[PDB]
Structure formats: C-alpha cells, structure tokens
C-alpha cells in the first residue's frame, strides 16, 4: 500500500522534498486564520494509523499556537473550545515554524447518525467522553499526566 | 406594492421563468404585493427548480462524459392553474374564444429551430379532435369567409366561440417563447376540454381512428343551420380546399368526395374554373346557405356569374 511508502517518506523529514514542502505550506498556513477547517489531512498515513477514517462525520482541523503547558494539549483545548459539539479524539504534528507550531487535529461528530450507527466508534458518543481534551484524556494528555507503567489517615473498628 | 424587479428578486427566479409563471397565473399592476405572495406559494416554482437542477446535472454529466448517466437521468401539467383561472367549465369555454386563436394559428405553422416538430404535431392533432367533435354535435352556425380566413363560429353551449381557421397556404414566419408558453397552456386546457366534450357526447374516449385515410387527406376525414344539406353529396373541384368544405357538409350531415382522392346522389359539384363539363355551383353558395340557412337554389350561384355582396354576418 501507499501508506507503507508514505510512512518511510515522512520518516526522513530533513530530506529535501519534505523541507521544501514544509516551507511551501508554512506560508499558506499563516495566511489562513488561527483556526480553520481542513478538507483533507496533509498526512493521510498518520491520521489513518491514528484511527481516523474518511467516512462521513469525521472532520480535520488545523490550529496555530505560539512557541516558547504542552503545545499539543493547548492546541487540542483551543480547537475543542471553538468546536464545542465535536470531540478531539487525537492530534498530530504536521509543520513547525520558528515563531509558531502547527498541529493537525481530527474531530469526530457524535451527533451525526453515521458515527452513532457503527459499533467501532459509537463509544465516543457517550457523555463520559464529553470534552475529552479538557481533562487531558487524549494521547498527549495521558503522556503529560505521567501515566507510565512500572517505577516510572485510616482507622478500623478494631 | 413592489416593483417588478423587486418581485423577481423576492422570487429569485429569472425573468424567463417569471414570464411563464405570470402567463399561467396572471399578474399586472407597481404590482400588488398580494399577487406576488400568492404566486410564491405556487408549486410550479418547485417544478421549475427541479427542471433547472436536472439541466445542470445533465450538463455536468455531458461534460464529464459517460453518456449513459445522462440517458439514465431521464426518469407535468398545470391542472391546478386551470381551476384557478377557470372556476367552472363555462368559464373555460368563455375564455376559449380568445385563447384558442393562438393554438389554431400554431396548427399551421412550419417547423423551425424556434418550434419543435412535436409542438406542431400536437397542435395539428388537436384540430383533428376539435373538428371531429364539432362535426358530431353540429354546432356550426357561421362560416364567414374572411381574408384572414374562414371565421367559424361554433355554438359551444351558447358562447359562440369566434375561432378563426387560417388558410392552408404556407404561413411564412417576434418572440415565439411567449407564444410557446401560451400554446402549452392552451394545449393543457384543450386536453381536459376535449375530454369533457367527448364524455358529454356519449362517445367512448379515446375512440378509434383511421390512418390510411389520414395518409390520403390527413385531416377531419379520420378519428370517427344543422338541417341544411341533409343527405347532400357534393363533388369538390381542384380549386377549392376540401378541409373546409368537407367539414361543413359533414356537420350538416352530407358527404364529400375529393377529386384528388386518387392523386350516385351527386346533387351538386363545387367548381370555380371558367370552363366546366351534377349541379355546378360556386363555393359561395354553401357559405351563404350555412350563414343563414337559406337553402337557396343553385340558380343564384351558377359558375362564372357576378358574386353577390357578402356582408359580414355580425
């Protein structure tokens, strides 16, 4: 599949092709608003391996955050604030700049009947998952919370 | 009240479709708001939008290719408007007197880029039913032979429709688009009017028709004042239109034999040539007799004699 090659191509980010792509896309991202909808993910392999699908109900956003709290979590919270009715399942890096960093975030609509009608994603419609990014329950949030594995008063009646 | 442009913008419908909507409904002064509001609620707007969407989707398919999609995409009548403008059948008959002139004119127009052959065929066929019905109830009362044509007046339940029959000569060819909409509306009205008239006549509708006879004359002799010319049979010379003479005689109850049939009680022969070799009579005799029921003998209309002053019967 193309993803097998896309992953390896994206691995060598310092390569000339990706260096040119990043500097081409940085200006386009800057000309856009702080938060704007993305028709398609610029890194389809990353999104697809992150559980994103092109079926109806899935929405890709992009957001710019100043450089210099975790940037990923801040971006997720910022996109969730504007996208109140959407759930920020996950986010990933796409481009970085000297003054700003760009992280792509994939949103899943729980109200859409398509998302509710499939068993592979209906779990996200539960009220427990509301504002998932707010509580830092995402991948970036869990990592920031330090949820690692391993080392890394009470009085009874008698 | 709102301006015509303001009303169009409110309806957000191009002027081409607004013309059709107004013709179907009728709006005029600058224009009263209530009429525009009533028009906006008409279902015809939805059908027009559907037609526009169909056209744009067809264009999309044609540009993309795969003509099969365009062919498969191919899968109405203003009945409600008829009731609104014609609350009752007598009202429709009353409005016929001026509405059907357009249809009768279109019945003889030539096919061109501005008018599809189907429209002309439908207009001609509508005449084949109108004349057939009129030749059974014998409602013809006037036959004024005017320069514009033979001004027929059929007593259609006492409204004396003033429909005019254009001459069979080529009608050499204005914005036909409005004329096309008027013709479509009049044909939609004619469908129901003819259905009602045929049902009233007691004949099963649609009745059978003969096509071999149509291939010979193509007209009233197919598709299956009144006391005049009872059982009379007339021979028509090569200088008269059979389409007009035959209809009047058939309505009167007689019969006609065409000279060009291969191109007895023969009381009269209609001839206009100065040379002749049956009671020879000019065509004016039949018209004069029908106009007043005179049933005057042939002595007053021998061929070659001075024509009498035919005053207009109105």
């Amino acid at each position: 599949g193309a993803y097998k090659y896309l992953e390896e191509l994206q691995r060598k980010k310092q390569s000339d092709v990706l260096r040119f792509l990043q500097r081409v896309r940085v200006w386009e991202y800057r000309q856009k608003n702080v938060i704007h909808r993305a028709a398609r993910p610029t890194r389809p392999d990353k999104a697809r391996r992150l559980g994103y699908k092109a079926k109806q109900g899935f929405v890709i956003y992009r957001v710019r955050v100043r450089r210099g709290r975790s940037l990923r979590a801040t971006a997720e919270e910022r996109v969730g604030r504007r996208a109140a009715n959407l759930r920020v399942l996950n986010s990933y890096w796409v481009n970085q700049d000297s003054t700003y960093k760009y992280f792509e975030v994939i949103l899943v609509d729980p109200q859409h009947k398509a998302i509710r009608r499939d068993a592979r994603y209906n779990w996200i419609c539960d009220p427990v998952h509301k504002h998932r990014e707010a509580r830092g329950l995402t991948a970036t949030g869990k990592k920031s919370r330090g949820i690692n594995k391993g080392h890394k008063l009470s009085l009874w009646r008698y | 009240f709102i301006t015509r442009s303001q009303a169009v913008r409110k309806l957000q419908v191009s002027l081409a479709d607004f013309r059709r909507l107004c013709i179907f409904k009728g709006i005029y002064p600058f224009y009263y708001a209530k009429d525009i509001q009533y028009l906006m609620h008409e279902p015809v707007l939805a059908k027009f939008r559907e037609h526009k969407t169909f056209a744009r989707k067809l264009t999309r398919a044609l540009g993309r290719g795969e003509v099969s999609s365009a062919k498969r995409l191919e899968e109405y009548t203003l009945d409600h408007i008829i009731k609104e403008r014609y609350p009752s059948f007598p009202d429709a008959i009353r409005d016929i007197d001026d509405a059907l002139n357009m249809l009768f004119l279109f019945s003889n127009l030539p096919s061109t880029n501005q008018v599809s052959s189907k429209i002309i065929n439908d207009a001609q066929k509508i005449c084949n039913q109108w004349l057939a019905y009129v030749a059974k109830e014998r409602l013809v009362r006037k036959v004024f032979v005017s320069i514009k044509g033979v001004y027929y007046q059929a007593n259609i339940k006492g409204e004396e429709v003033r429909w005019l029959v254009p001459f069979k000569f080529p009608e050499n060819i204005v914005d036909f688009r409005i004329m096309l909409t008027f013709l479509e509306f009049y044909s939609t009205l004619l469908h129901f009017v003819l259905y009602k008239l045929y049902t009233d006549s007691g004949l099963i509708y649609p009745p059978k028709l003969d096509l071999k006879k149509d291939k010979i004359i193509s007209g009233l002799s197919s598709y299956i004042v009144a006391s005049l010319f009872s059982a009379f049979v007339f021979y028509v010379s090569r200088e008269v239109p059979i389409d007009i003479l035959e209809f009047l005689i058939l309505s009167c109850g007689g019969n006609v034999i065409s000279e060009a049939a291969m191109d007895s009680k023969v009381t009269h022969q209609i001839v206009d040539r100065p040379v002749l070799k049956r009671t020879y009579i000019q065509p004016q005799w039949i018209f004069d007799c029908i106009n007043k029921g005179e049933l005057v003998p042939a002595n007053k209309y021998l061929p070659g004699e001075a024509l009498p002053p035919h005053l207009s019967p109105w």
Partner: protein, 226 residues
Amino acid sequence: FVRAESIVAKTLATSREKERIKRVSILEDKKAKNETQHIASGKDFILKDGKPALLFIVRVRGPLAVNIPNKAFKILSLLRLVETNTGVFVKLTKNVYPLLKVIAPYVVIGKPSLSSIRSLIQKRGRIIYKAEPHEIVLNDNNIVEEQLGDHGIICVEDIIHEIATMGESFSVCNFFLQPFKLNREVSGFGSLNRLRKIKQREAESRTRQFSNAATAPVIEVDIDSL
C-alpha cells in the same frame, strides 16, 4: 492550422468512396450492355425495379468530410441538392436508376404519400424570381395563374396533382418549386440539445447504412419519418 488526423481521415474516406463509385459504374456499364456473363448480378431488386415511380429524396449530411467527388457532386448538382436537408421529387426511370447507387451514400430515398406531398407543398415552397433574389413563398395563386397555367396548372392543387400523378407539367412545376429546405432534426445546441443530438445519432447508424456492395439492393425507407 489543421491537425494531421483530419487530412488522413479525409484521404482514406475519399479513396473508399472513389473505389466504390468506380466499381459501381464499371458494373453498371457491363449490365447495360446485357452481357451479364462474368459479373456479380444482372437483375435489380429492392428490399426493406426500374419501373416508373415518384419518390422523395432528402440530402443527408455525412459521411466524413470527403472532398467533393466529380461523379456524385455533378449528379447532386443536376438535382441541385448540394445543401443539406434539401429534398426534391424525381421521376424514377431505368436510366435514372443507377443514380441512386451513384449518390446513395449522401441521400435517402423512399416512397412518399399523397397527404405528405400535400402538406409539404402547402406548408413550404419557394419562387426565386422577380434584381431577383427574393425568396417569395407561394402566398397566392396569382403567380401560379400567370407564370404557370399554360398547361392547365393554375393553382397549388394542380401542382400537387401533377407531382402525385406525374403529369406533363411535372418538370416545369418541380423546377419552379425551388425545392424546399427542410428543417434539421435537432436544430439546436446547448445543455439539452447536445444530449438530444447524441440520442438521435444512434438511429442514424441503424437507418442510414451503406453496404458498399456493387449489387446492394436499393436502400429505401418510409417517408413518414418526416
């Protein structure tokens, strides 16, 4: 500027048309001589003879843009059917019989009807005469009574009878009629017209087909189509 494909296609079509015309003419020359000893066929037949019969002919467009060939072009010029969608009535004869094959690919022929002839005459008609560029329609019979009528053809009905009954004045009237320019089928372009033309073109292949055989039966189709 014109792309190469057009020139090559025109050349290929012209070669085939010229070969077919030459073969048909050579076979007809031997058939007329009545030798009929080493040819495909000598008799003639029509399937769906050279006996008299009034037929209507319509000039159809196509085939591909073949340069005007001498034989067919001259034959059409005799009937002055160069313009597309033009038709004229001709008296069928044994001498005229090979002309059908000579100009078969460009025209369609058939047996008309009295009603069709009457409708065509009464609905269309030209009199290109008195500068005399006017295309005056048969508005009145006065022109027919004056210029015509020497042989007794005084009105339009007389012309109809002569055409249908093959009268003496058939040649005179037919030339005077200035044969009619029939309207084209679709007569449009744009959103609906493109699809309508594409749909109509399919019937052309199944109706206007040329077998190219030297002994091909005369192609005939009912004139009731139009």
